[PDB]
Amino acid sequence: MTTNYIFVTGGVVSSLGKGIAAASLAAILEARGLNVTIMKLDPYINVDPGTMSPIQHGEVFVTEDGAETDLDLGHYERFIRTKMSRRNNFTTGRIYSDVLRKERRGDYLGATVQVIPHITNAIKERVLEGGEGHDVVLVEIGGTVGDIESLPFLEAIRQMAVEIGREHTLFMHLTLVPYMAASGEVKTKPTQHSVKELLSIGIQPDILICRSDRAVPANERAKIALFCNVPEKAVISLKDVDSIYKIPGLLKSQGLDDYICKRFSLNCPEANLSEWEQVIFEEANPVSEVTIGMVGKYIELPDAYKSVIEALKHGGLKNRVSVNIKLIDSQDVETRGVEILKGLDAILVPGGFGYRGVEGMITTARFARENNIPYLGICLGMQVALIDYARHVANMENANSTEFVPDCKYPVVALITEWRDENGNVEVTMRLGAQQCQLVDDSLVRQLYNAPTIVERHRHRYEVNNMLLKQIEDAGLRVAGRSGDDQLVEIIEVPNHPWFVACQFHPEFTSTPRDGHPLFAGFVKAASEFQKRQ
Amino acid sequence: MTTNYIFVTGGVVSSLGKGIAAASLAAILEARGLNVTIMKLDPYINVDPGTMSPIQHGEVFVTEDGAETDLDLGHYERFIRTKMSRRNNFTTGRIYSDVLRKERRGDYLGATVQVIPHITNAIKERVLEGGEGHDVVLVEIGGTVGDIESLPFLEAIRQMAVEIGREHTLFMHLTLVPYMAASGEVKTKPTQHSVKELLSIGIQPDILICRSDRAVPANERAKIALFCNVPEKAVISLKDVDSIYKIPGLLKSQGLDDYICKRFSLNCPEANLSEWEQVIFEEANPVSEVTIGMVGKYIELPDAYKSVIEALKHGGLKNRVSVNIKLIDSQDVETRGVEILKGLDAILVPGGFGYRGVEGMITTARFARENNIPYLGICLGMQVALIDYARHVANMENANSTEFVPDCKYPVVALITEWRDENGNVEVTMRLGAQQCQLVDDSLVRQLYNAPTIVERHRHRYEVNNMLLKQIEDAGLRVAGRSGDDQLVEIIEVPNHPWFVACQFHPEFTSTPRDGHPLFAGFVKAASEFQKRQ
Amino acid sequence: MTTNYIFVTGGVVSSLGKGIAAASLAAILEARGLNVTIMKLDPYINVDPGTMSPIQHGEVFVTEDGAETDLDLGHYERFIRTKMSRRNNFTTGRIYSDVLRKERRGDYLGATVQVIPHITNAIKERVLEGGEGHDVVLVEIGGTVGDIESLPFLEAIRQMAVEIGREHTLFMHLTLVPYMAASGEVKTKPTQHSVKELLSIGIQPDILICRSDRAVPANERAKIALFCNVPEKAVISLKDVDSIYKIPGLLKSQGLDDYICKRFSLNCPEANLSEWEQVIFEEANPVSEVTIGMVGKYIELPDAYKSVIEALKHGGLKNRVSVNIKLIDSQDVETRGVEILKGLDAILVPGGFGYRGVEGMITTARFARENNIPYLGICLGMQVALIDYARHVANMENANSTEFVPDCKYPVVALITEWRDENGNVEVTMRLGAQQCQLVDDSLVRQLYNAPTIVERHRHRYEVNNMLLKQIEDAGLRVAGRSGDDQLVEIIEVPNHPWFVACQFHPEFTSTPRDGHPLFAGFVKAASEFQKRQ
Ligand SMILES: Nc1ccn([C@@H]2O[C@H](COP(=O)(O)OP(=O)(O)OP(=O)(O)O)[C@@H](O)[C@H]2O)c(=O)n1
Ligand SMILES: Nc1ccn([C@@H]2O[C@H](COP(=O)(O)OP(=O)(O)OP(=O)(O)O)[C@@H](O)[C@H]2O)c(=O)n1
Ligand SMILES: Nc1ccn([C@@H]2O[C@H](COP(=O)(O)OP(=O)(O)OP(=O)(O)O)[C@@H](O)[C@H]2O)c(=O)n1
């Protein structure tokens, strides 16, 4: 039980799919009974993605331990069963923060603190932390080799390879092998120049993963094998694919996992990818099609809703339904009205912060509730569902969240400390990561989850106001799930409706292609049943 | 006045179209009344392409002065009217041969001969020799920047830029800006890394020519401008095109020629590209279509017949005929028979050396003659036409070339020194470049060329045997052209045929898209007339 | 068994003593009973040093086979007993000449000839030719790593290391570790940057030879070991020394030969360096001192007479005489007179071509003969001795060489084809390498060499004119040695003189510190005897 490390780097361009490649390889190794994990080294200065805007860098992924991480850890958890934590993602900012803190504590004993060895040492320590207790650790190095931003990471993993040795370390380098119409051939020259940059900083690649818009032929792979001084079997073709679920099979068919198990002297049975083959089959053979509207305030970058989009796809797989995801700007509902929500088989309102576009989401929730269109609200999607029902059924004029209208008469959503009734009377911070939720008997979610308790992940400040809840309950709304000593509302259901569910937690973070998710499976099923009625 | 130099380099990949880009820019500058020339610096060790196989290198192009050169000089002569010579193309091989000859002789006076300064000095001397006496000299550096083979060339042109100054030198660097489906954007990172390699060898690019399979948008051009420290108008998009004739217009529309004229302080009128607009109009508006079979022994690389393929296209422009060029392996005629010559409106047998596939070409010549299918034979194409007629009409059994069957009874083709009749009685080396040919009255070619004398370019050793010619003439074959004191046969015609012409010279080398060529215009017209008769 | 290769490279500066280091290591390995050889790869374009001036390049060394080579092959033959040939030295010029000859001929079968693989293949072929049939082959790469001139050599030896493997190849890299008064320490940063340049071209050094003006301490060697990823015992201190004969001992004391034998799995006994210890003892314990004047025309670079200077030192070892070598410009004898030849215990006139300074050498030869000062003339030194005697004893007015005065009345020195007497009557090119010489009975050289025949090496065109010889013999000059069928004069002696010898051959090329040389031993002894008589 010596821990093995696969260092995953990228050359020529950034957008090679280093994360998907790492996750896909990890999936093959896990299917051989190996204990595998993945970690992402990000050369950005942000202490963590917590601050990074959804519009700029896509969704903030939440691990069970409540870490705010890169969306790549979503890819990792959708490919392997090993649970991600704070240890599986860190930035240059984190490393510099670590070292600056160690200096304050006096750990360096008045020594001059240097990129080598002190920054490189801090990097190695965090890689070992995240890696130890596993058979194989895949370490994705963000950036493009030759850029200055990743030089400390590359020096750190170079040192690790010398210490640990070539028996228990491999360098897997992704490269672009682009097609030129002029020559009717894919070109290895960019790979030649990228590998030279790698050699210049003291790294010899063991494995070349050749990215192209088509198969990289044996002739070109043999050319790369010779100039890199690696076996031809260590040069892998990874063409553009219509589904990332195919990549594990494509890598296995070229025997990449065999090469890795040989290099690390790992005796394990053949990879059983039957579950991945099933996912590919399901995706390729939908029985019917549905159009589901995702009404949010960050649609300008789809990666803002990465896990929600994948969760809707996984809902399709389990129902053998093709899901047409129509990304709708909630602000367009405010200006152009409810006419742009026509021709939808179901409506999803995802998570978000700030008031911009929220009134459009409240209108969207009302439209879905009144017209019996299947509805799933996530976090902000539950708030607007509660606000809708408060205003338009419970007759709480201008009911809102204190996040949006602090001095509103009916703050149906607010921080626990702000909880007040309509008369301003009172009783007597961000919730992050996994928490147990108690499901109410005879609720739809109790039926779908088939358990009295569930574990789902939070990323929110503002709660359902329990002081104004009973008046909304009396108006017909049903509490389907609660959590903690304060009995905070986790799930609500509108019962006089074919399928209307809204939750505080982020169910998209526990959805996988192989296992699906009870809420998303139920939601897409309801969408198909609605579509058949129309 | 002062001679200006544009050094044309390429990064990321070899196959950027550096020659086409240089030729297209030269076309714009010529259309502004400037005296422009182009030269090609090839990093190969071959003293010249004379030895290099067509299937390895593409066609050997022949200049008027009889130099054997890169096919790029064909691009140059098809875009500008400045005539190419030996001075417009040289290899590393030529430079080392020059320096070794100077050294072993004693020109260096017992000095140590070094890459710097002696190899770089030899390079600069040949660039000056080709350039001086022109307003603008475009110098294409073969290879990809970063490779070791072009480092001496790049050091040479770096020194020239220092000596001459930034007032009369520009660095124009072609780069690949490839599209990634993953990012949905073209990627500048390869340009970033390529420019870094240029800077490391002391070259700052003035102009970036951005190659891609689509337009490089203003936002990406703005990024390249900033990281290269060049004006935005010095960053040019050159997307993949269906027609190279459009490239002059594409570059002019982005003001590339304006920027160059400003940098070199050239006061000249706006480029009138009406001649190129006309070529584009002709090409886009064909009246009819033909299929012309090109039957040869080098079809595995189409660039083996680069100038012939372009000459057929030019023949189409002048007739408003779309030419579908079907490359047919002459060895397939030997094995599968004349079956594979079905559905052709005309047949062209191009040049070649060695006996492999020649019997297939003789069979092809016979097929075209007997079935009244328009035929054009070039060099070897004339040999197989003469052999066909000698064997199958003049009843000269197994008539051949001494190149193929040295001891044959009827050497109808042979070296002048080998000339013998069928009884072995006799009379009492490579022809290269332009030579006057005298056309015979009442010949098809005398009408087509509409002149008593023409100038065409040779690349051949083996002549028509004048000792056996009179017997072939008596059998009905006509001599249509002669040259020199030995009265060597240059053109033959089969009169009892709609269009049957074969020439010793290479007419494809004097064909241009603007001027066309009388022989190819006549050939494609005959192909159109045959197609209509069917 | 399997041939082992040690690739010897240099970084930071050129003048590291790569040749001396290679030769000194080879000496240790030979003293362990191994069959060892050395070869020099020069990045100069000169086909060979035959053209290169002595004042530019240093002496042209001549091997037994008559190859004109780098003076480093003199270092090699003075450290190991393995005889050098044409195979032990080649230039970039030779490689390009080889490849151009192969190309223009037709060995590459119409292929494109490229730096990689064709130039690198030609390099590897010549390394194999020189190396195969030896236990250990030391391959010295001329130039400084990072320079463009040696990139093909470094790529060639990189490929060899991959092909042969790390079991039978080592990279030994010389580096400068310079002392800074400011820091009071030697600096490893230049070694760091040099090794980075090696890594960028795909070479990992196995051994670091650290050059400095003092010992590189264990702490600095430990730093170099870590950043190069080599054992501490693979990092060697080679400080500046007063005697190159000490370097074998210095390297052995640090176990360099032990590390090499271990890496190559050579089981051989410990190096016995007693022969080198004896040379060091002799050198350190002289009994008397002499001043020997070397009067020539290339003294502006002492390396012009490298082997002659070493041969005089070896003459000192055998006699326990400390030799003070005073380099005197022969042109200063022409201007200032024989004043500048005062206080000399002996006079040596070495080889040379052209008339500049020759009259000064004739005056020098006369001075030594008339004043009974021991004289040794080598090649030109023999010519000026013959001319001196012809003019001033045999009364042949203005006697000269045809090289200097072609139409002179008494051409006592001339080409065999030019041989004429004073009346213009006649009888009815460069001699290179080892030739047998027959020594005459009762001659000084017959006693010194203690054999009737000797083998010495030539580099000359102009011979003693046998037509005018008998008259010079009658005047008292003695012929002491002859060669060949033409009975060419090899050695002359002035008998009425304590020690006056002059030879056509270059005896300095067969002198070694261990074996000495009979002629130089006799010369230095005569110098000592003259000094005592004063
Ligand atoms: N470090 C290197 C490696 C290769 N070459 C040169 O690269 C040329 C071949 O380049 P190219 O024609 O672009 O082909 P490939 O290297 O095969 O590249 P690609 O796969 O992109 O076609 C050869 O002449 C060789 O001398 C070089 O100069 N320096
Ligand atoms: N010499 C350089 C230049 C840039 N960067 C880094 O490159 C990153 C951006 O790279 P990428 O995301 O690939 O985008 P672009 O550079 O815009 O490249 P492309 O046009 O290919 O997307 C930045 O974080 C910057 O710190 C670097 O490390 N070293
Ligand atoms: N980028 C360069 C620059 C120079 N050279 C080579 O460097 C050699 C000269 O190096 P060297 O003898 O060390 O002399 P200098 O360069 O003058 O260095 P120094 O001042 O240290 O003596 C020349 O043959 C030249 O071809 C090279 O290969 N690449």
Q: Residue B209 is part of a domain; what is its CATH number?
A: 3.40.50.300
Contact (Cβ atoms closer than 8 angstroms) between residue A501 and residue A481: no
Q: Which experimental approach was used here? A: X-ray
Cα–Cα distance measured from residue B509 to residue B72, given in angstroms and rounded to the nearest whole number: 12
Amino acid at B64: E
User: What is the B352 CA–ligand 3 centroid distance (Å)?
Assistant: 47
- Nearest in space to A352 (alpha carbons), one of A482, A500, A490, A506: A506
The CATH number linked to A337 is 3.40.50.880
Q: For residue B213, which residues of chain A lie inside 8 Å, CB to CB?
A: 181
Dist CA A481 CA A470 (whole Å): 15
A53 is written with which tokens? 């805007």
Which of C56, C96, C108 lies nearest to residue B112, judging by beta carbons?
Answer: C56
Question: Two tokens at C402?
Answer: 């045809």
Q: Do A13 and B196 touch (CB under 8 A)?
A: no
- To the query of whether residue C57 is one of the catalytic residues in this protein, the response is no
Given an 8 Å threshold on Cβ–Cβ distance, is C200 in contact with A196? yes
Which of C44, C103, C115 lies closest to B113 in CB terms?
Answer: C44
Angle (CA) B168 B172 B173, round 5°:
150
* Cα A189 to averaged position of ligand 1 atoms, centre (Å): 7
Chain A contact probe: residue of B16, B176, B191 with most A CBs at under 10 A: B176
Q: What is the DSSP string of B334-345?
A: HHH-GGGGTT-S
Any known ligand binding at C48?
Answer: no
Record the tokens describing residue B203, joined without a space: 């070259």
Chain B hits for C56, Cβ within 8 Å: 110-112
Question: C461, C415 in Cβ contact below 8 A?
Answer: yes
Residue from C228, C162, C200, B198 nearest A196 by CA: C200
Our answer to whether residue C379 is catalytic in this structure is yes
CB pairs under 8 A between B and C: 102
Q: Are residues B210 and B334 in the same domain?
A: no
Name the nearest CA neighbour of C277 among C322, C232, C310, C247: C247
> Are A199 and C196 in contact (CB < 8 Å)?
no
Catalytic annotation present for A506 = yes
Rg (CA), chain C: 25
Cβ-nearest to C199 among A162, A200, A229 = A200
**Helical segments of A86-150, H only:** 92-105, 120-131
Q: Is the beta carbon of B200 within 6 A of some atom in ligand 3?
A: no
Q: Are residues A67 and A133 in the same domain?
A: yes
Contact C103 B45 (CB under 8 A): yes
**By the 8 A CB rule, do B348 and B308 touch?**
yes
CA–CA gap between residue C413 and residue C417 (Å, rounded): 12
Nearest to B59 by CA among B75, B43, B44: B75
What are the distances in angstroms from CA C64 to CA A273, A491, B406, C85, C456?
71, 98, 49, 7, 8
With an 8 Å Cβ cutoff, are C52 and B114 in contact? Answer: no
A256 and A297 assigned to the same domain: no
B187 in contact with chain A, both atoms CB, cutoff 8 A = yes
Do residues C244 and C327 share a domain?
no
Cis peptide before B269 (omega within 30 of 0): no
For residues B148 and C152, the answer to whether their CB atoms sit within 8 Å is: yes
| Euclidean distance between CA atoms C119 and C98, whole angstroms | 9
User: And the tokens for B61?
Assistant: 């192009």
Distance in angstroms (rounded) separating the CA atoms of residues A368 and A431: 28
- Relative orientation angle of helices A151-164 and A120-131, to the nearest 10 degrees: 60
Catalytic one of A379, A408, A437, A503: A379
Pair C188, C303 in one domain: no
Query: Measuring from atom 25 of ligand 3, which residue has the nearest CA?
Result: B116
Instruction: Compute the distance from residue C51 Cα to the ligand 2 centre, in Å.
Output: 53
Structural domain boundaries, residue A24: 1-285
Q: Which of B231, B255, B285 is the last residue of a domain?
A: B285
Report which of C424, C446, C436, C445 is spatially closest to residue C487, judged by C-alpha positions: C436
Residues 6+ apart with CB under 8 A from A41: A90, A123, A127, A139, A140, A141, A142, A150, A153
| Listed residues C225, C260, C285: the one ending a domain | C285
Ligand 1 atom nearest residue A185's Cα: 22
Q: Which ligand is nearest to the CA of C142?
A: 3
Query: In chain C, what residues touch A202 (CB-CB under 8 Å)?
Result: 199, 229
Q: Which residues pair with B325 in a beta bridge?
A: B292
Contacts of A143 in chain B (CB under 8 A): none
Q: Are residues B325 and B274 in the same domain?
A: no
- In whole angstroms, what is the distance from residue B330 CA to residue B338 CA? 10
Q: How far, in Å, is the centroid of ligand 1 from the Cα of C117?
A: 10
Q: Are residues C298 and C328 in the same domain?
A: yes
8 Å CB contact between B62 and C114:
no
For C272, the token pair is: 């016995």
A14 Cβ below 6 A of ligand 2:
yes
Under 8 Å between Cβ of A351 and A534: no
Identify the burial level of B181 via C-beta atoms within 10 angstroms of its C-beta, where 0-12 means exposed, 13-18 middle and 19 or more buried: exposed
SS3 content of chain C, % helix, strand, coil (to 5): 40, 25, 35
CA distance B38 to B319: 31
Question: What distance in Å separates the CA atoms of residue A130 and residue C480, rounded to the nearest whole number?
Answer: 87
> Any binding-site annotation on C525?
no
Residues 137-176 of A with CB under 8 A from B: 144, 146, 176
Q: How far apart are CA C57 and CA A491, in angstroms?
A: 89
- Which resolution in angstroms does this entry have? 2.0
What is the C-alpha separation between C7 and A531, in angstroms, rounded?
76
CB-based contact (8 Å) between C196 and chain A? yes
Helix (H) or strand (E) holding A368: helix A358-370
A74 annotated as ligand-binding: no
The terminus-to-terminus CA distance of chain C in angstroms comes to 60
Q: Please give the full DSSP string across A471-520, using - where no structure is assigned.
A: HHHHTT-EEEEEETTTTEEEEEE-SSSSSEEEESS-GGGT-BTTTB-HHH
- Same domain for B41 and B72, yes or no, is yes
Residues in chain B: 534
Domain end residue (candidates: C252, C285, C318): C285
Indicate the angle between helix axes C189-200 and C218-228, nearest 10 degrees.
Answer: 20
Tokens of B464: 């028509």
Q: Which of C379, C385, C343, C378 is nearest to C361 (CA)?
A: C385
> In C325-379, which residue ranges form alpha helices assigned H by DSSP?
330-336, 358-370
Angle at C348 between CA C343 and CA C354, to 5 degrees: 125
C116 lines ligand 1 (CB under 6 A): yes
Strands (E), C193-263: 207-212, 235-239
- In chain B, the residue whose alpha carbon lies closest to the alpha carbon of A178 is B178
CA angle A245/A248/A252 to nearest 5° reads: 150
E strands present in C66-199? 68-69, 89-91, 136-141, 169-176, 179-180, 185-186
Give the CA dihedral A296, A297, A302, A304, nearest 10 degrees: -100
State phi, psi for A169 to the nearest 5 degrees. -140, 145
| CA distance linking residue B67 with residue B88, whole number of Å | 10
C310 and C357 within one domain: yes
How far is B478 from chain C, CA to nearest CA, in Å? 36
Ligand 2 site-directed mutation target among B188, B224, B227, most atoms within 8 Å of CB? B188
* B214 and B348, same domain (yes or no): no
- Contact (CB, 8 A) for B169 and B161: yes
> What whole-number distance in Å separates Cα of residue C300 and Cα of residue A122?
58
CA-nearest residue for atom 29, ligand 1, is B147
The beta strands (E) that lie in B60-206 are given as: 61-62, 68-69, 89-91, 136-141, 169-176, 179-180, 185-186
- Do residues C445 and C519 touch, judged by C-beta distance below 8 A? yes
> B280 and B291, same structural domain?
no
Q: How many residues does the structure list for chain A?
A: 534
Q: Domain tally for chain B?
A: 2
**Comparing C-alpha atoms, which of A202, A286, A206, A155 is closest to residue A25?**
A206
Q: Which DSSP category does A9 fall into?
A: E
Answer yes or no: do B114 and C155 touch at CB < 8 A: no
Instruction: Tell me whether residue B285 is exposed, middle or buried, using C-beta atoms within 10 angstroms of its C-beta: 0 to 12, 13 to 18, 19 or more.
Output: exposed
Residues A128 and B300: their CA atoms lie apart, in Å, by 55
The H or E element spanning position C284 is helix C274-284
Q: How far is CA C127 from CA A225, C7, C169, C180, C199, in A?
A: 25, 10, 13, 39, 22
Whether the bond between C374 and the residue before it is cis, its omega within 30 degrees of 0, is: no
Q: Which two tokens stand for residue A29?
A: 């190794």
If asked whether residues B299 and B275 sit together in one domain, one would say no
Q: What angle do CA C91, C457, C494 make, to 5 degrees?
A: 140
Measure the CA–CA gap between B385 and B362, rounded to whole angstroms.
7
Which of B482, B454, B455, B479 has its CA nearest to residue B469? B479
